[PDB]
Amino acid sequence: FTKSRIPDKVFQPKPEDHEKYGGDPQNPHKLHIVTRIRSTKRRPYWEKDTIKMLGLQKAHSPQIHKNIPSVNAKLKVVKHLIRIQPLKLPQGLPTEETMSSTCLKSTGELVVQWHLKPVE
Amino acid sequence: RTVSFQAKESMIRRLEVEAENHYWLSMPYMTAEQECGHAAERRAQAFEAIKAAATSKFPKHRYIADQLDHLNISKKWS
Amino acid sequence: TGRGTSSRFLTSVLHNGLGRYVQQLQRLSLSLSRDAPSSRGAREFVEREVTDFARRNPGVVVYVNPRPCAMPRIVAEYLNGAVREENVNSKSVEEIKSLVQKLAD
Amino acid sequence: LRNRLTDRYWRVQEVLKHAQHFRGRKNRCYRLAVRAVTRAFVKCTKARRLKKRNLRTLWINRITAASQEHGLKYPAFIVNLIKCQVELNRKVLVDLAIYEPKTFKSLAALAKRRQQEGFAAALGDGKEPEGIFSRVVQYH
Amino acid sequence: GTSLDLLRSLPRVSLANLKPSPNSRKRERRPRDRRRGRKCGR
Amino acid sequence: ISRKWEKKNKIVYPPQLPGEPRRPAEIYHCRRQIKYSKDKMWYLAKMIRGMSIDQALAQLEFNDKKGAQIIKEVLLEAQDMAVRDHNVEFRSNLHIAESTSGRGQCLKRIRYHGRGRFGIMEKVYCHYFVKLVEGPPPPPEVPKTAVDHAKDYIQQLRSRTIIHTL
Amino acid sequence: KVEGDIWALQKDVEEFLSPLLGKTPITQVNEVTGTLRIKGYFDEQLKAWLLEKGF
Amino acid sequence: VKKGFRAAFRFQKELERWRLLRCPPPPVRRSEKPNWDYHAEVQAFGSRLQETFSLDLLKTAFINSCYIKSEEAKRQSLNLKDNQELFEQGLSFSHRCLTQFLEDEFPDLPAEGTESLVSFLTGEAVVCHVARNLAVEQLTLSAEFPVPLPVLRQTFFAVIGALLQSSGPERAALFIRDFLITQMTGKELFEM
Amino acid sequence: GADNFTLLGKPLLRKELVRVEATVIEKTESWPKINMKKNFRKKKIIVNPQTILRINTIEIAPRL
Amino acid sequence: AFVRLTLPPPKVVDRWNEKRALFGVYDNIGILGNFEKHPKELIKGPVWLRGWRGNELQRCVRKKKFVGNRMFIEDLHNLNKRISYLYKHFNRHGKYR
RNA sequence: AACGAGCUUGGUGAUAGCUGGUUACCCAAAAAAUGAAUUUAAGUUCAAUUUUAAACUUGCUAAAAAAACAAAAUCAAAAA
RNA sequence: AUUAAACCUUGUACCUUUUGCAUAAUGAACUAACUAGAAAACUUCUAACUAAAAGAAUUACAGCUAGAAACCCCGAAACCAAAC
């Protein structure tokens, strides 16, 4: 049992894949939302290390990571233990005023105005 | 020995989630060459913090007030 | 220890909150030594914190008894008739102040 | 005998008082009482966490009893109440069934109505107006 | 000095008030408790 | 040793008021260091429990055990002092409130065995205790009737509460 | 053998030694003994320094 | 014989604990115990209930006729004023107050019902429970302890009589509502 | 809820509809609870602060 | 266990008897007395351990040096055997080599 | 009244790489059984691991091309 | 837990030992008392004085002096000397 190298074809999407997941092959998203959803117990030690490097020690708690190849390379190692979701900014990036009023939704949207009131 | 219906359904769910992980990992924002050096400053100062703590170890100050305060144990109402 | 001990149900002394809230603690007794290392912290409680506690609680009668003593002790009596006793031996002002407030509530 | 332990009496009493309600020599003999007391302590700690799961099993059984009176299986009752944005928990639901039978009956009708709406919505494919009770109040 | 002024206020020095310099003495460990008993480090 | 049973006869109660039930007289008597097993004595002491003085003496007079004669003598000693010292008006007006056997101070000896081996013999002694109360024997216990049993069952049902809820 | 305000002496030493090191020196003040302890070897610079102050 | 004085001292405490269980002490009046000042206790009683009293009247309310007889008997071997007059006013006012409240709440209920409930709420059992737990028994002066129930009931309403004079009917009505009208909580009609 | 009607929030009712008022009557601590994960002394006693609240009024207004 | 049923007689310590009152006097006889006498000369005790300290093996050998030839036959036999017991322990037995 | 060599006392607390036992609380960290020599494999010493304190600076993962045999263990700039 | 002692639910005695497992296996009838880690070469910590320290004999290219800190109990078959 040794580390495996996945064929490059796995990470080359198909036209229907873009339709299903609703992601444009151009203007790719910038930030990942990564959550660990399985345990590192009974997994090889290299998988254990990458999980600690990425900060996913606690399960079901989301961490933000750069959508850059070096980060992606580690994520591919632990692809089976995590869920990757594209961070969305419906109302734009938070500013100094809106830093204290943010909330990350389950949908993947970081809203900058969080009122806890009926939409009305 | 057959495999339950719970067991086969739950794995397919996990496969579907992992299938999506494949897709989201196929669209890197920055190429490899563009990546070089974009975070050099933060990494440099971060280690300087590590070194500063490591080399700042030293004994603690000792004060007269601590030693002389033990005498208060025999304080009384005169 | 549940099967080895008694149990009761949630209750109030005389429907305390229905008409008017009444404070159950009704008496505090503090015995002290004028000169004893164990009672140093209790002595400071009398100097600084006893009067303010007495004013905040006008239904609690407070008795302070400086006397030749070996351990300072707090005795708390309630309207329903319960009596509770506390060793105050070698406790700081902060601990004795914290303990006294818990008894009142 | 320069130094001899002088508190052994109170050390023995500590273990014994936790054993007086046992039967046999376990209740009076320290060597046997000590082992019996520890097993009780281990059991007492572990039962603290099994208590919370046993009461939830009890609540579910009582809820299934109350819902089946009105003709609903437990899964349908719980699920369809949630889809109406009602966040009553299982402990509170049991209290309603036992002490508020008329209010619980209304919840059963409400959960049945939402279930009835769900069948029509899924059964009729395409764009059909959403059910009256299937409307979801959004928050922001 | 200011240190001597503190002595003026403080209670008398006596045999009942003595204390060693902090950390002057280590504490010796007997092989009695479970941590240091049993096989006793051997 | 401990010899409390003898002093139980020296309690002095204060004079009773005219409007109060007459207190029954109580007599405590014992025999110490009887060459007899306390276990064997238990059966004799047990048998006369609750019986009247004359009934107990009749049962003892025709028993073949050694302790039976010993218990009879104690009862006669107790009966006489009750009239003589405890102001009991009638000899027959007495019943055995308490009667029990206690261990005494024994001796250790050697019982020989076949192969140069031995065992620890015990020369057993016992105590005998009685308390005599003036008045007729209390009435015997009556078994619970069917209706008596049924009512308890219904009370058990009526005590029920809804468990683990408001 | 430092008498007076031992804390004042530290401030002066920190200013005196900082330019050479480029950072504030790590020190311990033992007020009971009356001694100032500095990390690293600075005896030569600190002996000439004291001579000029006249100690 | 093992060294030391402390172990013997600890076991002396145990011997005290056992003796009390086997031979429980006769209950004693709290006054006879240390840490007691009558004047301060009376003021705390008023302040406890968040009410203002005229201390002279309150002291009279606690006094009982039986107490005076005992003191005179000891004196034989200041006449003062008994709670009687205060007792009558307090009982009479309380009877009207309880009746008035029930009629407004339960207009239909027959006059026979109000008399029973009013008698129940002013009865020895109900007043005894309230009076004891408000410290009334501690402050009562009487010739016998524990205070007999009729004497305890008499003083409790005497306190209301003193309160009525000091702060008027409006405040006295609140006191009846707070401590007596609460005692019918959870009680079905035909139990009372 | 009442005898003849009830109001349900989604998931909470409006402030105007329902006003519930309580009082804090007692602040205490629980009885000593034993935690023992063996020995007889490898034991922790847990006491946690507690508060008792009396519920005084539930009021509704016609703002439906 | 069993415990005393009565308090033992009160123990009285008089803190100002001559021995307690004047304890410690003439302990600076050297520095305050021009060093004619060392304080160790003021110690009262066994001849072989005045102004000296050692472990049990060292104490056994030193007692033998000072009074070995004035000891009783039974005591010298026991003293000699104790030396050999302690010699074999300290030099052959223990955790640390 | 236990003779392949009597019994008693002393030497003597004989020695035992073997068996058993080795007495309060709490916090923390934590291996192995890989390698080497040994009348040595029921033991011990060293390496290796672990640990505590101290000094100061790069470490872990990953690591292209290119190399040493070859279609992943060594080695391994920049990065992240 | 319970309104309720028992019914309902959960739960493969302990120490050592195997191996980090036992339904192995050793030891324990129970009570009271008694019954097993001891040393300063080096290291660390706290002070005194300091090119010197130590109350003679010693160490020293910041050292030297003092304090504190450490390494178990029981058990053979045997061997030898002198008596009996």
Ligand SMILES: [Mg+2]
């Ligand atoms: Mg669960």
Ligand SMILES: [Mg+2]
């Ligand atoms: Mg023979």
Ligand SMILES: [Mg+2]
């Ligand atoms: Mg036998």
Ligand SMILES: [Mg+2]
């Ligand atoms: Mg040996």
Ligand SMILES: [Mg+2]
């Ligand atoms: Mg070997």
Ligand SMILES: [Mg+2]
């Ligand atoms: Mg290996």
Ligand SMILES: [Mg+2]
């Ligand atoms: Mg070789």
Ligand SMILES: [Mg+2]
């Ligand atoms: Mg060889």
Ligand SMILES: [Mg+2]
């Ligand atoms: Mg690199």
Ligand SMILES: [Mg+2]
């Ligand atoms: Mg075997």
Ligand SMILES: [Mg+2]
């Ligand atoms: Mg030691």
Ligand SMILES: [Mg+2]
């Ligand atoms: Mg040999």
